[PDB]
Every structure is written in C-alpha cells, then in structure tokens.
Design an enzyme around this catalytic site. Structure first.
Site, PDB file in Angstrom:
ATOM      1  CG  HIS A   1       1.006   6.385  -1.243  1.00  0.00           C
ATOM      2  ND1 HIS A   1       0.045   7.366  -1.344  1.00  0.00           N
ATOM      3  CD2 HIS A   1       0.414   5.340  -0.623  1.00  0.00           C
ATOM      4  CE1 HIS A   1      -1.077   6.938  -0.793  1.00  0.00           C
ATOM      5  NE2 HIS A   1      -0.878   5.710  -0.348  1.00  0.00           N
TER       6      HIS A   1
ATOM      7  CG  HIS B   1      -1.765   1.234   1.361  1.00  0.00           C
ATOM      8  ND1 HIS B   1      -2.413   1.842   0.308  1.00  0.00           N
ATOM      9  CD2 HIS B   1      -2.054   1.972   2.458  1.00  0.00           C
ATOM     10  CE1 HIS B   1      -3.055   2.910   0.748  1.00  0.00           C
ATOM     11  NE2 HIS B   1      -2.854   3.011   2.050  1.00  0.00           N
ATOM     12  CD  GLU B   2       2.078   3.524   3.858  1.00  0.00           C
ATOM     13  OE1 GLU B   2       2.393   4.632   3.369  1.00  0.00           O
ATOM     14  OE2 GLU B   2       1.059   3.362   4.566  1.00  0.00           O
TER      15      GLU B   2
ATOM     16  CD  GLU C   1      -4.666   6.333   2.011  1.00  0.00           C
ATOM     17  OE1 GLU C   1      -3.575   6.625   1.474  1.00  0.00           O
ATOM     18  OE2 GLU C   1      -4.756   5.435   2.874  1.00  0.00           O
TER      19      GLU C   1
HETATM   20 ZN   LIG Z   1      -1.996   5.597   1.864  1.00  0.00          ZN
END
Ligand SMILES: [Zn+2]
Lengths: 387, 442
Positions: free
Chosen positions: B232, B228-229, B268
């Site tokens: 980004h 998830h990170e 997000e």
């Molecule tokens: Zn996030």
C-alpha cells in the site's frame, strides 16, 4: 417429535460467507454506448546511507477534521426450522462435561447437556455400548473403524447433473434445506439442483444489457462503414466483458457461500472426533485390568489418527464442493447470461440492418450486398470454458 | 540490498538517523515523537496511532469495526515495549531481504519519493512546503519544542490503532492527502503495524493440505503481513493507489445467511493479488492503467517546464529533484532533450507494482503457509515473541528445523506449536448474527 425452541445461537460475524452486493461490482456492461469512427483501446545493489536532514521550510498547519466514531449493531435473523447452526450447536460438548453419550435426535442433544448429536446411526450404537465386560481395544477400534468407513461414504447419482458423486452425510450433519427429518438429501439435491446447498439464496438473474446507438447525421462518405466495423469490435468486447462480470459475481458471491459448507462440515466432523475422544477417555477411566498401562501408548495413537482420518474425509468434501461451485457457474449463471447476450445480439443486429436501410444511396458502389453478408460475424459466438 | 540498521530505544538523538518528529496526522499524540531510520527514507516510530477526534486506546462499549477486534491500552507505552517493537520490525526488514522480491520491494520504496507538487501547483514549479512530502524535525530548546529541520520520508511505520488487529489502518487517507496518491504524484505512507499480534487462517477449503497430519489452523507470517502493508505504501508512493471510493460492498438480506462484512476496497484486492483481482473486471483495471499513464506523461511534461520553486530559496535544487523523480518514474529522453514516457518501461513498471508485488506472490516466494483466497475465514488470532530465535528466525520464520517443524508440520500451526499463544475470547470483541426462531418446531 416436537420441542419448543426458546433460545438463540450467537454465530460470529466473520464465520459467515461474504456475499457482495450485485450493484456494487460493475455496471459498465449495462450502460448504453454510442459508437464513433475511432473507438479503439489496446538494480538495488549495495548503496550508502545518506544524511536525511534538509533545511527547514515554512509549512502552514494542515487542519485535518478527523474521523467520526461509528458503533456497529448486531443482526437478528429469524428462521423457520433447525438450520445448520442449530445442528452444529447440538454436536458441541458442554462446559466441563462428565458422562457424555451420543444421540440420534437433535432436539435431545440441544436440551440436555450430557447428550451430544451424531449424524451416524451406526456410530450411536457402537459408541454408547462401551467396554461391555471385555477388552478395551476391541470396542475402541470398532468405534474408529465405524467412524472412518462412514466419513468416506460417497453415493453415485446418475441421469442429471455434471456432479459425479455426492456425500450423503452432509444432509443429517447440517440439515440443508430441512433435509433431515424428511431424510431425502440425495433426492432433493437432484430435483432442485446444485443451488440447493445455498440455503434460501435468491435465484441468480441478470438484467438486460446496454443498447448500442449511432449518430443521427453520419453524413460523410466512408464514415458509415468506418463506424460499423467498430460496432462489431464492441460486440466482441460485450461478450468478453459480460463473462468477466459473471466471474466477478461468482467469485465474490457464490464461491464464498459454497466454502461455508466446507467450513461447517469440518466443524461438524471435528465435534464428532471430540465426542469420540472424550468417550474413550471416560471409558478409559472406567475400565480396569492388567493390560491397561500396556495399551496407553497405542490408545493415544488412535486418538491422533482421528485428526488424519478427518482430512481424508475433507478431501472428498473439498472435491465435492469444488464441483458444486464450478457447476453452478456453468448451469445456473451462464445460460441466463448467454440468453441475455443473444437478446442483445438480436437487438444490435436489427439496429445494424436498419442502419444500412436508412443509408442506401451514400458511399455505395453497391457495397450493400457486400456489407449485408458481414452478418456472418453474428453467426459465430464467443464460447466460455473452465480450467 | 538496502542495509537494515540495528537500533535500541535507549540510543540517544544523534541528529542523523535518530530524531524527534512532529506528526500532525496522529491525533492521539499531540507532542513530537521519537523516530528511527532503519533504512534510507523508511522510518520506524514506536508509538500508538489514532486519526479520530476524541481518540482512546481503551475498549469501547460496542464494536467500532466489522473485523475481529482486540484492545489494550498497555501495549507500546513503556520504553521496554517500544524497544521490543523497534527490534521486531528491524528483524522483519532483514527477513524481507532474504528473498529477491523483497530486495526489489524495498528498493522501490527507497527511491520512489513523493513528487514535490500536485494538481494545485502549476506546471513550472516545485512545491517543497507540503505535508504529503515533508515531515518536521524538532529540538526541545529551553522547555519548548522548536522547528529545526525537515525530512523527506517514503514510509513512516507507526504502532497499531486502538484496535490492534486493524489491518485496513494503512488504507486510511483523508482526501486532501489522498489526491496525490491517485494522480501519479504520490505521498508519504503512514503504516500502523503490530508485528507480535497475528491474524490466523485454515486450509480446510484448499485441498493442498497435509495428508500426513491433517487440516491445520495456521498464522500469517509477520513478514508477509508487513510486506502486505508495504505494498500500500508502494501504491501510495508511486501514485497508482486506487481510491477508497472504488470498492465492493457486502449484501446482508433476510432469506439467506451472509457476513455483515466491511467494504473490501479495490486496493485491497490488488495488494492481495491472485484470482480475487478478477472480482474487479478488466474494463475497470484497464481504465486505471490508462489513467496512471496519463498522470505519468503529465508529470514528465512538468519536469520539462520547471524554473521557479516554492519556497523561493530552493532554485539551486531544481536539478537535484529532476534526477530523483526521473529515476523514480523511469522516464526516457527524446530528440529535443526533454523527458518522455517510454510506454514499454511504463507497462513494465505498472505491472510490477500491481501484479508482481502482491501477497499471494510473496507467500509462494518465502516458503510459508498463507491465505489462498482473500475471503478465507478469520480464526481466533494469536500472539508470538518474534525476537526469540528459538521461536522465530530471519531465514525460515516460525518453521524451524531443530524443534521438529518441517514445511508440512509447519511452526505456523497453533495446535502443534506452544510459542503461538492464543488471545482469550473475553478480551476479543466480535459482532454477531443472532440465529433465533421462538417457535415450537417439529
Ligand atoms: Zn491491505
């Protein structure tokens, strides 16, 4: 009766529904627009690791200011009745209980530590009896039998609404819209509608859409027709993009609030099972006999079966709440959106008629009769469906 | 598969993959910090992080965020804990390479280095002297830190903030750093992760649940949390990161009950994926594609006109960085010889980084229980020792066969697994919406 409530309940911030701001979503559909002559839109393998070092270079020091620390405050929210959060706190066991007993009154369960609220009158009878000079499993199974049959309850409302069935015990469990005490969850849900489950939530309403306009001159031959065909493309876009905005509001504001009842009812049903588990263990200590050590293995299975039987009741509530969330979009939001789109259509059509009335003589081999018949585009409209 | 190199914190500086790095972005640690390269251009730095002026690892008086918060000054200070933290991420990076989408994800991060330049730099120049691309390597020569070399990393993986449960820490960028990440050029990512500490959720809303056992309170698999990170970083590196200006804001009003939430940014929702992406309408999502396209076209035209460099001594390396960034953005060649953007290959690239690479897509691929919609309730968080193979393996995660954990009876369940230890509510800070009345009532 009455009972002076002088104390607060601290509900955690991230055990509440996220509701987005209406202005925060997207304003594009409400903005005005001018239509022109050309408005138109639409391996890794096995490698080698290399030396990552490189020759040094003169970098000036990047002066970063740094983030400012911000302290956030709590919220107080005064309410005129014993809402869901009060009804939930009554159902909880106290810190290190002794001899708990279920009670049909919420105000008694809040005041006294040993007393715990229940939303099932028949359960309050059979639980508080205990082992009345008899066998253990005779009582214990009758409590769980009564617990199971009551959580699978479904009432069939007819005449109004796409909702086929409603779960009646949500009313006395969470006191939705002050339903308990009055005792008319079934009646109030039908009369007010599906929005009843949103406690004091402002009624949905959409502002007027953006206006279409054209140039004042538009003096070229071929040019007025060249832009009117593009006007009808942007009308279809406005119907499309208005539905996407409606869904953006539904997903961020409505669906979250409906799932709050799913979470609250699981907490409610879990506290009831914890009360039954505690009462069985207390009555197990109080009971005595030759058949006591024999049933130990069987009684622990009856405790674990409660966790399975809640999921059976939850799958009904999920099915019920999912309908309520979906039927809100169909009957509360969508009609207001279509009505505002029909106002937009009539306003855009009167603009298009008067655009042709202004420009009669230019670019015509009497194509006015042909172009006036293209209003048949407004005859058909873009529908909306689910699943 | 890019290979995940094994390390210890005891291992010395070898002037290759283990180095000492100067990081001006971290305010907490002014001195240089020990770094390791687990794979090409992806570095681990076992250190705590903070961007605030007057920073502190200690617990504040009132809550600094809307999220569920937990502080600990003890975490990631001693060398034993840094050795645990280093092996943790190294173990997670191995678990990413178990499925195909993870191999593809890592590959994008390795090859997609940030462009040597920005809007300030003219068309005919590579700028090799900027902090968004470069990080300074340093020796400790005679009681002082001297600047020796540089590196060109893609992702720097730091430890957590003062708040260990802060997941939005990776989105924190300071405007001047951010502008590259919007406009196609990209920037090096700075992640702040805590592998052992886990967020928790339940499947009460989702009818896809265990009819055998019941409704479970489960944890996020730390590989999915890391991936998830890393999405980004993927957006920051390829210059399609949506700005923090574009966001959803929470409504709190008297009349109805709601969360005093954080601002959920557009990034997000993209990085999570699924149905919640439709919160952003298509008119906005289309605009981001057309903007990203334009930047990719202007970056291709920059590569056509380059001749000088900053500094002046890097003119020999012009053909080197032409090959690096051509392979990144995946440009084609037209009848002149110049680079050009193939639109079908752009759409394929952009849709891969937004729709394919996302949290909901990973959770299905890796065979793990996970959050179904972004606004699922945050339950009490948990701790877990991921390095012990009896608790957590590379192939299956928490769901192990030998300890009686099938997929329905997941090891991710906190109730049914003792290894998933709970954090005490004395230490865990929270905001509260206070429900009062102060009346007689009937
Ligand atoms: Zn996030």
């Amino acid at each position: 009766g009455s009972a002076l409530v002088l104390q607060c309940i601290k509900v955690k911030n991230n055990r509440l529904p996220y509701v987005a701001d209406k202005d925060s979503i997207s304003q594009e559909i409400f903005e005005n627009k001018i239509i022109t002559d050309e408005t138109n839109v639409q391996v890794p393998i096995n490698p080698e690791i290399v030396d990552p070092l490189l020759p040094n270079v003169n970098m000036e020091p990047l002066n970063l200011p740094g983030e400012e620390i911000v302290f956030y405050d709590d919220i107080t929210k005064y309410v005129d009745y014993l809402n869901s959060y009060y009804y939930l706190e009554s159902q909880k066991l106290s810190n290190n209980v002794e001899n708990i007993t279920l009670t049909t009154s919420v105000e008694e369960a809040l005041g006294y530590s040993n007393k715990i609220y229940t939303f099932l009158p028949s359960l309050a009878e059979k639980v508080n009896k205990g082992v009345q000079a008899g066998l253990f499993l005779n009582w214990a199974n009758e409590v769980v039998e009564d617990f199971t049959t009551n959580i699978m309850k479904k009432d069939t409302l007819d005449k109004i609404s796409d909702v086929s069935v409603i779960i009646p015990y949500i009313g006395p469990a969470l006191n939705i819209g002050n339903s308990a005490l009055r005792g008319n969850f079934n009646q109030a849900f039908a009369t007010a509608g599906v929005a009843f489950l949103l406690e004091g939530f402002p009624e949905f309403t959409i502002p007027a859409l953006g206006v279409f306009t054209f140039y004042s001159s538009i003096q070229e031959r071929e040019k007025i027709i060249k832009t009117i065909e593009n006007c009808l493309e942007q009308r279809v876009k406005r119907w499309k993009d208005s539905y996407q905005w409606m869904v953006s509001n539904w997903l961020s504001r409505i669906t979250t609030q409906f799932n709050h009842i799913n979470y609250q009812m699981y907490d409610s049903l879990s506290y009831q099972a914890d009360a039954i588990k505690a009462k069985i263990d207390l009555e197990y200590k109080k009971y005595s006999g030759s058949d006591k050590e024999n049933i130990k293995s069987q009684v622990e299975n009856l405790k674990n079966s409660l966790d399975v039987k809640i999921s059976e009741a939850m799958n009904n509530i999920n099915k019920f709440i999912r309908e309520c969330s979906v039927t809100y979009l169909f009957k509360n939001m969508l009609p207001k959106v279509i009505d505002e789109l029909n106002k937009f259509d009539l306003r855009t059509k009167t603009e298009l008629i008067n655009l042709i009335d202004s420009h009669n003589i230019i670019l015509v081999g009497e194509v006015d009769r042909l172009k006036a018949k293209v209003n048949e585009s407004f005859e058909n409209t873009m529908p909306f469906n689910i699943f | 598969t890019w290979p995940v190199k094994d390390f210890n914190y005891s291992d010395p500086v070898n002037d290759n993959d283990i180095l000492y790095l100067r990081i001006p972005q971290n305010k907490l640690i002014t001195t240089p910090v020990k770094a390791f390269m687990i794979t090409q251009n992806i570095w681990v730095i076992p250190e705590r992080f903070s961007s605030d002026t007057n920073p502190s690892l200690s617990k504040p008086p009132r809550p600094t965020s809307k999220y569920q918060s937990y502080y600990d000054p003890s975490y990631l200070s001693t060398d034993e804990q840094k050795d645990t933290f280093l092996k943790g991420i190294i173990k997670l990076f191995k678990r990413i390479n178990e499925r195909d989408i993870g191999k593809k994800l890592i590959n994008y991060l390795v090859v997609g280095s940030p462009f040597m330049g920005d809007s300030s730099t003219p068309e005919d120049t590579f700028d090799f002297t900027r902090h968004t691309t470069n990080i300074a390597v340093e020796k400790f020569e005679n009681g002082s830190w001297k600047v020796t070399n540089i590196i060109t990393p893609s992702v720097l993986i730091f430890g957590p903030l003062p708040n260990i449960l802060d997941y939005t820490a990776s989105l924190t960028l300071q405007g001047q750093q951010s502008n590259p990440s919007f406009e196609g050029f990209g920037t090096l990512s700075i992640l702040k992760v805590a592998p052992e500490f886990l967020l928790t959720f339940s499947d009460v809303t989702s009818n896809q649940s265990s009819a055998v056992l019941g409704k479970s309170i489960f944890c996020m698999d730390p590989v999915i949390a890391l991936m998830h990170e890393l999405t980004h970083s993927l957006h920051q590196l390829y210059g399609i990161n949506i700005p923090s200006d574009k966001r959803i804001r929470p409504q709190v009003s008297e009349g109805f009950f709601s969360q005093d939430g954080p601002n959920v940014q557009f990034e997000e929702l993209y990085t999570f994926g699924g149905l919640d992406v439709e919160i952003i309408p298509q008119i906005e999502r289309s605009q981001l594609r057309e903007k990203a396209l334009g930047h990719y076209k202007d970056i291709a035209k920059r590569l056509n006109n380059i001749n000088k460099t900053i500094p002046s001594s890097w003119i020999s390396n012009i053909d080197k960085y032409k090959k690096i960034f051509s392979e990144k953005y995946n440009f084609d060649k037209d009848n002149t010889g110049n680079f050009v953007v193939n639109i079908d290959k752009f759409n394929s690239l952009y849709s891969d980084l937004t729709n394919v690479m996302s949290e909901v897509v990973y959770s299905s691929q890796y065979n793990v229980k996970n959050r179904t919609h972004y606004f699922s309730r945050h339950y009490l968080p948990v701790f877990a020792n991921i390095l012990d193979d009896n608790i957590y393996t590379i192939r299956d995660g928490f769901n192990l066969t030998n300890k009686g954990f099938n997929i329905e009876n997941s090891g991710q369940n906190i109730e049914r697994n003792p290894a998933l230890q709970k954090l005490s509510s004395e230490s865990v800070v929270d905001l509260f919406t206070k429900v009062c009345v102060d009346g007689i009532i009937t």
